[PDB]
Structures are given as C-alpha cells and as structure tokens.
Symmetry: D3
Subunit: 267 residues, 6 copies
C-alpha cells in the first residue's frame, strides 16, 4: 500500500484525505455529547464560552470536568482558600447556566497542586467511560510560554486519558464494575497558538463576556480593565484568521498525529 | 581565543568545524557497538529498523534497551496485560533476529507508567557503563505533538543518562563494584521532525516492514491498513530530504549543544 | 472596551502600549534590588555576569539564589561530591565578589536532583517575600534542546514562584510569621534563544570571563579550550542583534503573556 | 452520660456492651456478602481458606480483592514475572473454585511495589461502594516482625478504605457516577498475633491445604516440606486457644477502637 | 564514667536522675509558651482540652498548629469539603476561645492527605523557630491500633521537627532570613496508651466537653450519644491511674530516649 | 506432615529445631564475610563495634554499607553539611581501621532524607549480589520509640533487600550484567529491645569507645558527658542478660519468622 505515490506531498494528502478521513470543515457537526475540561473554574467560559453556547443551542449536551478548586485565586489576605473555592463553585454554576451547561464534575484537586500522575488519568478515564462523549475539549499543553503547571498538566492528562479510555487493561477495575472502554471521536484543543478550526462568535461575544464576569471573585472591575482588552484582542486574533470580528480557535488533528508523527505541524 | 572572528556566522562555523569537530557526513562510520533505546517493544523497528539492519550488516553490534513491557497495547478485554507482555517479548525477539540484533535488556517498567526519575537514569547508566557503547539512539523528546509520556521520558532520560554515565559521583555504587564511568561518542535521536542526517533505506524497506509486522499483537491486518500508509509516508518524508525514495532520519548534535546553546536550532 | 480597534495588529499594539505599558527600552532602569536565580554555582556568571556587574556598578543590590550544590560537576573519581560542593561554594563567593554581589542563598538541593515541586516553590517564595526584589532573573525554561532537568526546572519554578509570591493562600505560614505577599516588577529570562532586550557587555567581557574562571573546578585549562570559544560565540550571537561586539540577551514579557496568550511569541 | 459508673473497668464494660453493642460470639452470623483482601495470590487461602469455605457453604457470597500480581514469586531465572503473573491468576481461579469463591478483582499492582497512597484507597473504595459488602477481611498490619511491605500496606489501606468509603467527599467522582457511600458492618483481620475470634477448621484442614497447593508455582514439593509444618503449627496456635485441633484466628474490634482508643488492647 | 555502677538497674536510675535530670513530678511547671499540634480541628480539645485550660489559666501562652483542614469530616452528600473546612475553622476559633488559646496556625493540608515528608517538617520547624516554645504537645504515633494516617504522621513529624529545629543545616533558608535554631525543652505525647504523667481534670470536665461540642459539625447529638460515653471512659482510664475521677494522660521521656534506647519502655 | 504432634508447644519446638534448624548457640560461627548496614557514619561502631572487632579478629571480612552522609549532624551554624559529610567520611575510615574493617560502601543519601523506596532496595541488592555475604547486620526497625526515620527505614530496607536479592525478577538488570541472585545465611538486628543472642564485649569496651570517639565531630567532650554514661548503660543492659559486665545484643530469627508468623515473639 502507498506504493504508487511519488512525492511526500502526495502521500501526505492521501494519508489525511483517504486513510484518516480527516477534515476541518465542520468538525463538531455530529456531536451529541461533549466534555469540556478546564484547569480552573472559568477556563471553559474564557477559552471557549461562545462555542459552548453554540453547541448547547444546537442541542449538544455539554458537560464540564474542572480539575481544580480555584483555592489560590485571590490577593485578599482575609479570604481563605476554602471560602474562595466555595464561592467559585457557585460562580461556575451561574456561568454554566448562562452557557447551557447542566453538569459539572469537580475533581477537587487543589489549585496550583494538580498532579501529573496515573491517578488523575484514572479520574478522567472513569468519567469518559461513564459519559461516552463524542468530543473532548481541553487546553493545548504546547501553548508557547504557558507558565501555569495546572494548565499544561490538564492538556496532557486530557489527551492521554482520551487515548487510554479505549484500553481495557488501563484502570481495569472500571471494566470490572461495568464501565466499558470508550473511544472518543474527536479532541479539540483550545487556548491554542496553532488553531486550524475557528468558530465565529461575533454575535455571542457579549454573552461570553457576561459568562466570564459571572466569576466575580476573579474579575473585579479593576482586573476587568485589563482583561476585557485582553479577551477582545484574543478573539480578534482568532476571528481575523477567517475574516470575522471575533472567533474562538481550536486545534484538531487525526488521533494518529498525537504520536510519532514528524509532520504533525503541517496541519 | 576566538578574538579574531568578526561575525557570529564566522564564529559559529569555526566553533562547529574546528572546536567541536562536528560533521554529519557519516556520523555512524566508526561505531563498533550501539545501544538503541525504545520506549516499547517495536519502537526500534518502527523508528530505525532499516538502519539497524545496515549497522548489523556492517558488523556493528546493536543492543536494545526496552524501557517498558508493552502491557497496555491491546483493546481485547480478554487479554491481560501480563499475557500481552509475554507475547510481546517473543515478538521482539523475532523482530530483532530479522534485524541482526542479538541482545535486549528489558527494564520492565509497566507501559504508560515509565517514571521520570533518578532511579530510571541509574538503570540506563548501569547498562551504558557495562556495555561501553560508542553510540546511543533514542526518540527525540522534543517531537512536536508527541503525546505519549513514555516516549517523551525515554528521550530525555536517554540524553541525561548518556551525560551522567561520565560522572563518577552519579550512581557511585557502580564505580564501587567495578563499572567505571563511560563516555559515549554520539547520540542520535530518531522519531524526529528536525533530522540532520538521513539514511537511505529504499532497498531495505520490505525487510523493515516485515520486522515491524513480527509484532503481530500490535499490527493486526485491520490496523495495518492505516499503519503501512503511515509508515511509507514517514519514510518518504525523510527520503525526499536527500532525494531518495525511503529514508530514516536522525538528529545529531555536538554534546555541547544539548545545554545552554541559544543557536542549537541552526543545525 | 477595545471595541474601536479594527484589526488584531491594532489591538495588539494597544494592549502592549496602553493597557500593559510594556516597553523594552530600558527594562532594568528602575531596579534597586534584583535576585538572580541560578541552577548551579557559576550559572549567573556565565549567563549574565556582564549585566550583573553593570547593575552592581549602578548601585543595584544583586542577590543570588543557587538552587543546587554542584555535587556532580567532576570527572575525578577521587573527588567526592561533598568535597566538590564545598569547593564550589568558595568559588562562587570569589566570582560573586568580582561581580559586586554580596549575598547568596544556597538552597542546597543536590545537583541533578532538583525537584519540581511545591516545596521548592515555597523556598523561592520565602526568599522573594523576605527580600522584596524589584526584578528576578532566571533561565528561560523553553530554550530549545536544553537537556539538563535542573535548568528547565529552575526556569519554570522561578516564573511560578514570582507569580505565587503575590498570593496570600500560597505558603500561608509565611504570612502568619510576618512575610507578606510581594509583587515583583519584572522577570527577565537569560540563557534564551528568543531575547528581546540585549545588554552590551563589550567592555566587560574580560571581567566576565575572569568571574567564570574563578569556578576553577569546572573550567580547567583543557575544558576552557572549548568553553572560551563557546562563550565568545554566544556573546557574539547576542551582540550582533544590536550591532555591538559582545552582548547578553534577556527575554522580558508582560506578566500576562506567561499565561493563556496565543500571540506571546510576537514579542 | 456515663456519670454513674465508678471505675474504669465498669465504664469499659458498659461502653463495649451497651454503647457499641460489641460481641465476639458469632461475628460473621449475619453476613450475606464479604470481601477478602489479599496482598498476593494465595493469601486468602493461606490466612483464612477454612473460614472462606465455611462461609461459602452457608451461602455467603465471598469476593476477593488481590492487591498485586505475584510477579516476584519465583527463584527460576528463566521464568519472567509476566509469565508468573499469568500462571498465578489461573492458580488462584482454581484455588478459589475449591473454596466456593466466584469473583476476584485484580488490582494488578506489581508485587513488592504496592503503593501506600490515596490512589490505592480509591481503588478499594470503588469496589466497596459497588459491592456493598457486609464484612471485609484483611491482614493485620500490626503483626509483629511482618517484613513484607505489601502485607503491611494492604492491612492499613483496607482499614482506611472501609472507613473512607462512608465519606461522600472522599473519591467524590464515585458519588457523581452513582456509587453511593457504603458503611461496612465489620472488619476482621487475619494473619494476626492477637486474635479474639477463632473459627474451628479441623474438618476442613485437608481442603484448605489442597486450596493452598493449587498455587503450584509457590508450593513446590521442596518448599512444601517447610510450609506444611508451618501451616499446621499456625493452625494449632489458633485452635489451642479454643480447645480444638486446627483453628483460624481473626481480630475484630468496634470501629471506634481503630482510632484514639488507649485501651484497644484490652480486647 | 559509669564505671562504678554494678547493675543495669543502678546505671539506669543514675542515667535518668543524674545525667538526664529527668523527672515526672511537674513537667510543665516552667513553661511560658507551648505549642499543641493537632491533626484535625478538635484534636487538641479532645486529647488535652483540660490541660490546655489549666495551662492558659496559669498564664502559659498556648498556640495550636492544626495540620489539616478537616475537609473529609462529614457524611452529608450535600456539604462540600470546602464548606466544611470553613465551618470547622470557625468551630475551632470558638473552642479555642473557651480554652484560653489565642493563636492557631493552619497548615491547610487536606484531611486524609497529610504528607509524611521533609516539606511538612519544614512547616513545623519554621513555626517552632519563630515562636521558640518551651514545650510541644502532639499525638503519640505509637498508639496501638491507631488507623488514621493523619494521626500517626502528625506524631512522628512533630517529634522529628522538634529534633531538627535545632540543626542549622536543616531548612537552612530559615537561618538565612533570621529564624535561628531553637531547642524545645520538653515534648509531651497525648492520645497515649503509655502515659507517665496524668493531669487531674475532674473540675474542668464539663468545660472540656463544652469545648469539644463547639465543633458542632463533628458532634451532632446522635454522634454524641457514643462520644460522651467514650470520652468519659478515656478520662476515667487516665484518672484511675492517679486515684482521681477524670484525668488527661501524657507520655514524657528524656530526648535521648526517642533514639536507639533499648529500655525506653521502662519509663 | 506435623500430624503427630499434639500441642502447639510441641509443634513450635519441632518447627524450630527440626524443620528450620534454628539455634542461637553460635549464630556467627560459620561466617566468612558479613555486611554491617548503618544509617549514619558511626552507627556500626555504636551498635556493634565490639562484635565487629571480634569478627575481624577471627578473620571474618567485615564490610560496611552507610546509607547516608551524616550532613545534618552539627549544631555549628558555620559548618556546612557538605563540609561535615567530608569530615565524617574520614572519621569513619579511622573508626573502621580500629575495628578491622577495610571496605565501606557509601550510598550518599542525605541524612534525614533516606528514601523508603525500591530504588534504595536496588542499591542494597546490587551490593549484596556483588559481595555474596554470609551475614547481614542492620538496626531493628521495631525498636520501641525509635524516632529517626533514617534508622527505621534502614532496618526495613535491609531486611527486604536480603529477601529480594534471591529473586531474579527483582532488579533484573543486575542478572543481565552478571550479578546473580544471592541467598544470605543470617540476618542479625542490632539496636534491639528484644535480643536473643548477646556477645560479651567486656574486654573490648575501651576499644569500642575509642572507635566511637574517632567520630569527633559527633562526640565532643560536652556531648560525651552524656554519651559515655548512655553507652555503658546500654552495654550493661545487654551484658546482664548473660551474666557479663558489657554485652552487645542482636536479634536473630529464622527467615520464615519475618513474615506471617503469629508467634515470632516467642523467640
Ligand atoms: Ca514541519
Ligand atoms: Ca534559531
Ligand atoms: Ca506566533
Ligand atoms: Ca493495655
Ligand atoms: Ca522493656
Ligand atoms: Ca506472643
Ligand atoms: Cl494490502
Ligand atoms: Cl489496500
Ligand atoms: Cl507542568
Ligand atoms: Cl471604567
Ligand atoms: Cl589560550
Ligand atoms: Cl589556543
Ligand atoms: Cl512526560
Ligand atoms: Cl487489504
Ligand atoms: Cl468600561
Ligand atoms: Cl475604559
Ligand atoms: Cl525536567
Ligand atoms: Cl592554549
Ligand atoms: Cl442518654
Ligand atoms: Cl444525654
Ligand atoms: Cl510499608
Ligand atoms: Cl516427602
Ligand atoms: Cl565525669
Ligand atoms: Cl571523664
Ligand atoms: Cl501513615
Ligand atoms: Cl439523649
Ligand atoms: Cl516427610
Ligand atoms: Cl510428605
Ligand atoms: Cl519512617
Ligand atoms: Cl570530665
């Protein structure tokens, strides 16, 4: 097989088009149920809140997994992390209701302390095998200059857990209690410098910003004076790539390209 | 010293040519004994099986270190990881005999569970100091989008262990039992997006694919319908860089360039 | 806000200039006290020794944090790591006196064994909150091909600790004993392939090299035959970017750009 | 309350009899389903095989959890640990069939490598909440001179996991996927120096030894020359305490007494 | 020295009386400031609340260190651990006010997750060196059948941290920021089966129970039906040893006897 | 087998005498080479220095393994741990020369930081398989009130490593490089409260104390004012058990009794 192509370019295009059936025209069109994985409360709204509302409005069931409790998110010396975390749980429930999300799994690892370990994979694989989602979204762990370990770890752990949820010898007590192996149909990475699929969110921008500001403990008016300009600059960065005002970007690749693929940066 | 060069380009070329005596013309020409380090059983055959057979045919002694047992490599709910691992040991012995390899060290860490720790360095440094290889091959841990931790950890651990095998205070009980410090002459990274040395394997491609399919538990006919096209697309990617049909690529750099070198990407 | 810009380029420039007040004209001009964080003894002198002497000569108080003890830095089978570490402490005190530095904190993690953990963050945050520095320098952990874990871990741990020193629930027993939260004004990364600020050190090059060779255990005459050419090639690499003979490069970015910023590579 | 007792002895008997309703007369009488936790394949049959057959014969459903795979149990340099683990799975299935057990959960931690961690608690609590056992048996981790860490860790982890299975904030994703908190009715520790309940197994001794010898890989005839004398010495040690030939001993205590109880050694 | 004694009993009494100046007559007589270490909120009041009020009433400054946040202490599926931790902080502040305590350090490790590590030692040694207490109280980690790891770990970590607070190379950045080495004068272990000093608390029993019940989230009336009988049984156990109704027991030993002392059980 | 004994006492004596061939008459009689494991420099001389000189004088080859470097053993704020470790190496070489020992392996883990892990087992098993000792001595990890983790960990790791050195799948790269499995003939635990074999050291006491005081950094004259009385009290404790002035005690048991043996405290 693949003996009749003559150049790498020819082989590459045939591998993507025919063998992997990959395209970027409307990658989320068939989704019935997606899980959006966020490192802290508010990251699904910041990274992809417009698209979450598009998906809920089409009748997609969007479920969050929040990896941490947001304990560390304050500079008030009088507000304990415990009280902050309780506050943030309510803020996310209010944000999520704005976006059409009705279920959140809280892993409750402490903010700034998310482990990178098999144990956290097992928590992700348990929920992926219970919910059988068609799609999983997570941060791109290869974003340049990303300095928060909880973000980098969430991205890697999500990609690894999507792969390992298919393997019956990984976390085998799930299979023994009736949670069968599950194969997700796509991953899409948000918070990405290398998007290849952009969603126009120009008419939902004001809703997205409302869902973000529902996390009031994080976005005081003072902080917002920097964060609205940042958020609009990011959404312009993505929307300009497809000639629209405001976009959200995602990077989608064939499953194969997450491993031993020396030309994965050609998509 | 280096006071008479006038431009960075001049200094750079003099550093590579004169000070480091680096060239890429035939980096493996003097090798008598090499170790090829693979994360799982089948990675030496996939990444570099053609070159392994070229080297064995020239009378190079090629030894494998396999970091993990391949336990997780099945979607059959009836096949335990234990039985899989035993199967894969036999598959690698058959693959390796095809390629001229006569010795495999099995570290036996469980697949998906390779640690990144001093303990695994010590296992690598023990074997490097026992065997005194001239060359070590391993995966490039900086391959973009590589999502398997066992692959990234193998690459980093191999580069670090090659450096630390030279230091008598690293794993000092080896020196005390008679395993002296050893200085390897080259590292070459396979599974790389940035190769700088390509081996033409056009006439050994069918042998390489036979050695890969000897890992029958991994490459069922169904899976092969995707993997032959992938493997030929990869070998075309490398061979086109030197104007041949099928190549294997390696990245080789002076030892110095693995540390504090801001222009290491210029080779 | 940011509703009246029309293109991403416009928004980007406004975000940097107006919102973040970022510029690279003279980033170190207001500094009274800086901490330079080095993985091993001799890295502040190698990475940035010229700039350290410029800063001390202007009356900046430069303090080092050395993360490890340099135990592993010898190929002499008769020199224990313990004796090496004591030697290197004296070498750094002599190097530092040449450069105008009068205080060194030694974390004493063993060389090749620096952890990447909350515990080491807490050591950095304790010293940052005690000393209240205006600036912190550390290695760029994203240097391509950097293969020493102690270097990569130092860079990440320094960036994370600068951020977490502002949070009263991070290492909260410091606040309880009277070490208040501290907000550093800039980070600058040395050992970088992507500098955006270069310091001309042409007239201090011979002093920098003397301060390096004060680490005599590392820079024997044999080793120096490679390291002087390397060091001059690096300083030419940086100086050529601003049209001077010898430079030291730093990468400086707005705090925001270390997190979720998809165009952080545009500066 | 407890104001009218006059002596510690009075209060102690009243606390055990009335408040905690503790007695040792027939502690396993009401059990419908028990889990027996073993460190390695064969420990349930060695520690308590007689009692397991008594309980199965009364229509108790007896389920095993085996913490490890038995990989290390051979002195044959030609038998890999993977092959040994597969052989031992089949030996335990044959042993268990003799004793009336029809379900084994295999946690598959490697022998000599069972972790002491929250992750292994979570595996135990998942199975306890799925199966809702009335009783759990495990090794007494306070056996004097017990030198195998897998045995000590299994006993402590089993005691902790029975307590933490009742707490909805412990392993909270189990509650989210519908595995509710479960409160076990008794724990009984086998392999104990301080039994307080002894089961007469005199007429099932030969069956117990048959069930042990079904683990042929561990009990070769040479090894059996020491192990039959040992096993009969242990069962006499227990049986003599109740005036019977062969006994199996267990230590049972009120749940309160596993915590902050300074007179727990009085039962 | 010690050449003129003839029997072990003679040498032992001379070592305790003369060399170590040990006696149990009034071990807390000279204390001006003590730290009481508790695993969870409420353990100081349960283990030693009477004695705490005696010491505060004599003008001793009593300070708590609480190792964990009490997150796991509920069976209510609607009460998150974050909300429980906030509630328990307020309960301990009310309990502590009843007992005369005016300062609590919260280490905030999560309940059931206290680590056993150098990092937690460092937290203890930082507070011991800041506060310079004369005495430290902690749970006896050798209590038989103690099954809660947070309790065992707190006792061992407290004993080790009191020893290591005197060593300037342990946590050496404390010395560098001006927290000098401190030598505590006594340790006393509560929650002990082997007390050698008992405090009569008969007239403070009702106050002790009030201070316990201030932790309302833990001591609902249902739970109290078992806990008052337990607590009065324990205080009778101690009080009967000195001929009083209700006592709190402590184990005090010379510092030497916590290490390599084969007759430490003779006191 | 063991069907004709009638009582537990009968079976027990037959198991010890006949099956296990255990006796305590002269347990060290046949030894040609022993390894004495110490946590810190000076523990072999303190725990068993008399017996070490008796064995060297009979032509036994006595080898030390020291687990840690003694870094933390000073209260001088001017003496770094690195300098202390170098000083203690020389002190142990002088102590060892007095006692007839000619070989010390230094594992160089930092004092107060010895890990409890498979990695440290592997270091012990490498040396045991290289040297093939007949006997191994180590601290009894069950000494009551022992509060130094390096001591507890050394005892447990030494017992486990002697067992696991016989297993070819444990640390299997040793077998691959030609270090075969080794079966030690006896273990003896020193620093024990439960000795069952006592060596009369009355005429070597002064030499033992000289060998201890050779660790001058630990035994200043001030400290010696407490330590000579302690050491003579301990040696009287042991010697009185066999009717001699000064003794060193050891606990020896059949290998079987370190595992699942409920009457191991009867010897
Ligand atoms: Ca490319
Ligand atoms: Ca470049
Ligand atoms: Ca860019
Ligand atoms: Ca008792
Ligand atoms: Ca005693
Ligand atoms: Ca006994
Ligand atoms: Cl085909
Ligand atoms: Cl085909
Ligand atoms: Cl990370
Ligand atoms: Cl405004
Ligand atoms: Cl020169
Ligand atoms: Cl020259
Ligand atoms: Cl990784
Ligand atoms: Cl086909
Ligand atoms: Cl505004
Ligand atoms: Cl505005
Ligand atoms: Cl790293
Ligand atoms: Cl020269
Ligand atoms: Cl009542
Ligand atoms: Cl009542
Ligand atoms: Cl253990
Ligand atoms: Cl026979
Ligand atoms: Cl005297
Ligand atoms: Cl004297
Ligand atoms: Cl514990
Ligand atoms: Cl009542
Ligand atoms: Cl026989
Ligand atoms: Cl027989
Ligand atoms: Cl320990
Ligand atoms: Cl004197």
């Amino acid at each position: 097989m693949f003996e009749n192509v003559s150049t790498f370019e020819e082989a590459f295009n045939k591998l993507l088009k025919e063998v992997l059936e990959f395209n970027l025209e409307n990658p989320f069109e068939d989704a019935k149920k997606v899980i959006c994985i966020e490192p802290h409360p508010d990251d699904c709204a910041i990274g992809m809140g417009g698209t979450i509302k598009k998906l809920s409005d089409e009748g997609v069931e969007v479920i969050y997994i929040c990896m941490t409790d947001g304990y560390m998110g304050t500079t008030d010396e009088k507000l304990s992390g415990h009280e902050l975390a309780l506050i943030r749980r309510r803020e996310e429930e209010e944000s999520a209701k704005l976006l059409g999300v009705r279920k959140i799994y809280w892993l409750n690892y402490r903010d700034t302390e998310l482990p990178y370990s098999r144990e956290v994979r097992k928590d992700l694989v348990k929920i992926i095998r219970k919910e059988k989602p068609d799609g999983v979204f997570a941060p791109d762990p290869w974003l340049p200059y990303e300095s928060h370990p909880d973000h980098r770890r969430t991205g890697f752990l999500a990609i690894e857990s999507v792969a390992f949820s298919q393997l019956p010898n990984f976390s085998n007590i799930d299979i023994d209690i009736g949670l069968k192996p599950h194969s997700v149909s796509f991953i899409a990475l948000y918070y990405t410098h290398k998007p290849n699929y952009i969603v126009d969110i120009t008419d939902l921008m004001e809703l997205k910003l409302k869902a973000i500001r529902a996390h009031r403990s994080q976005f005081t008016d003072d902080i917002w004076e920097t964060w609205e300009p940042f958020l609009r600059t990011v959404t312009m960065f993505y929307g300009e790539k497809i000639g629209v005002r405001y976009g959200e970007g995602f990077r989608v690749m064939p499953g194969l390209f997450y491993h031993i693929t020396p030309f994965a940066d050609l998509i």
